Design a protein around this ligand. Structure first.
Ligand SMILES: Nc1nc2c(ncn2[C@@H]2O[C@H](COP(=O)(O)OP(=O)(O)O)[C@@H](O)[C@H]2O)c(=O)[nH]1
Ligand code: ALF
Ligand SMILES: [Mg+2]
Lengths: 133, 317, 38
């Protein structure tokens, strides 16, 4: 999959277009890894998977997500406030489809306001525009 | 020669603001199109700020000066969910302006140390009319005052005094510190930012932990670390302008129970400086330089950064 | 490999949460690369 020029330029229209695009998220990830903030995209996808994946795996998936992104000192510990975390940790006691909505929104805005802006000005994105068919 | 400089500190201590000043002072500065990009950030900061105060009204059980505001508050919360993030519709700003003028909201705003409120809440809210005036263009101060939580490690480069700076900006929250180790190699100098006005606040990550106590533990660990024996360490006691105002109404004893001095800028400020500097249990050998700063003041930052460069120059023999 | 370093049992939150890099205080900077921490 090689994005056309119009498609890649569209990633700059707004964050929603970039992250809602498979190739966009892949390009954005290369950038986040560069800034050591890849856990945010990892967490966002884990949430999307939990919500629209096999609804019988919710419990397992939620436990795994907690262990990887929420537990104090987690390998991919995410940057959310105490309240949001409290809300999430309580909800996880009794898992469900949208139990990570609060945390996911916070992390979404985190990337949009901070990482996204720099992404559009990075060499990585300029190159995506270059190789654009 | 090249200089690797690290900006370290707890969350919201002023690091990224210092980076913006480097852009304004030692780089290209901000263009019109660049400033326009901060509008959504500012509108976002403004709405989040008023919403936090409105929520604290119930949390601290403070009554509105006028009951008609109770309805305005309800409507603001509703709109907050429907409006496009980063926008400030006429109907929303009119509501915010009325709430801001309410004596109850003001009483709540003055008790901000009791909840979580953006530093620039007052700055933006007190001048909301200017911000929503057709043709509004963020000034440099409006940009410096903006708030965006940083995640990750970000590098910026510039030359000064014939030195090539590679300045690293990191996020300060607990979860972000797991990443700090990644830029600890070959560090020429470290600027550790402490928010002086944090003495009566608690962490956004842990509502039970006093913010200044957290900074102290961080500085203690950083200034006594083996990896930085040859590193120049400079302490920036930031937000002196906010501290100057806060010390008039909030006792330093909230942080240091034993403090017996007067609650004045000079005395309290020096006391805090001393509590941090004495964490250096190698004070004999190497000295830690410190400066009272206001990161949103371009002239102050220009001056202090000049003195930091001198140190680095002097230290590199 | 930064999470495969031994000797983490017994240390308090001051290290595991507040000052994470302290878990590697027994290592020299050149060893951090060698052991895949950085
Ligand atoms: N009044 C005032 N605000 C400041 C000062 N320093 C940072 N701020 C504001 O405090 C908030 C946090 O600063 P920021 O640089 O993002 O902190 P960082 O969290 O350490 O990166 C922003 O809204 C800044 O404009 C200061 O010295 N005085
Ligand atoms: F609170 Al920060 F960088 F420390 F946004
Ligand atoms: Mg920052």
């Amino acid at each position: 999959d090689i994005p056309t020029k119009m498609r890649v330029e569209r990633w700059a229209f707004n964050f929603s277009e970039l992250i809602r695009d498979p190739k966009g998220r892949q390009s954005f990830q290369h950038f986040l890894r560069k800034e050591f903030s890849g856990e945010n995209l990892g967490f966002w996808e884990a949430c999307e998977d939990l919500k629209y994946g096999d609804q019988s795996k919710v419990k397992e998936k939620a436990e795994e997500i907690y262990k990887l992104f929420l537990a104090p000192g987690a390998r991919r510990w995410i940057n959310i406030d105490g309240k949001t975390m409290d809300i999430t940790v309580k909800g996880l006691k009794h898992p469900h489809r949208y139990v990570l909505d609060a945390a996911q929104t916070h992390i979404y805005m985190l990337m949009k306001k901070d990482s996204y802006a720099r992404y559009l000005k990075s060499p990585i994105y300029k190159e995506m525009l270059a190789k654009a068919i | 020669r090249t200089v690797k400089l690290l900006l370290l500190g707890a969350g919201e201590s002023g690091k990224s603001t210092i980076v913006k000043q480097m852009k304004i002072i030692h780089q290209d500065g901000y263009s019109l199109e660049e400033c326009l990009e901060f509008i959504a950030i500012i509108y976002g900061n403004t709405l989040q700020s008023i919403l936090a105060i409105v929520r604290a009204m119930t949390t601290l059980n403070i009554q509105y000066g006028d009951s008609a505001r109770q309805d305005d508050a309800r409507k603001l919360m509703h709109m907050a969910d429907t409006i496009e993030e980063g926008t400030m519709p006429k109907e929303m700003s009119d509501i915010i302006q009325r709430l801001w003028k309410d004596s109850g909201i003001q009483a709540c705003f003055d008790r901000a140390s009791e909840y979580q409120l953006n530093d620039s809440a007052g700055y933006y809210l007190s001048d909301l009319e200017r911000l929503v005036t057709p043709g509004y263009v963020p000034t440099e101060q409006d940009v410096l005052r903006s708030r965006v939580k940083t995640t990750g490690i970000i590098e910026t480069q510039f030359s000064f005094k014939d030195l090539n700076f590679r300045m690293f900006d990191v996020g300060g929250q607990r979860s972000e510190r797991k990443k700090w180790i990644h830029c600890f190699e070959g560090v020429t100098a470290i600027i550790f930012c402490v928010a002086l006005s944090d003495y009566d606040l608690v962490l956004a990550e842990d509502e039970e932990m006093n913010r200044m106590h957290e900074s102290m533990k961080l500085f203690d660990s950083i200034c006594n670390n083996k990896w930085f024996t040859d590193t120049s360490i400079i302490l920036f006691l930031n937000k002196k302008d906010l501290f100057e105002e806060k010390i008039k109404k909030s006792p330093l004893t909230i942080c240091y129970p034993e403090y017996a001095g007067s609650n004045t800028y000079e005395e309290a400020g020096n006391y805090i400086k001393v509590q941090f500097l004495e964490l250096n249990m190698r004070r004999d050998v190497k000295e830690i330089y410190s400066h009272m700063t206001c990161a949103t003041d371009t002239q102050n930052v220009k001056f202090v950064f000049d003195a930091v460069t001198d140190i680095i120059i002097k230290e590199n023999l | 490999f930064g999470d495969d370093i031994p000797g983490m049992e017994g240390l308090g939150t001051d290290i595991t949460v507040i000052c994470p890099w302290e878990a590697f205080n027994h290592l020299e900077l050149h060893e951090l690369a060698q052991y895949g921490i950085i």
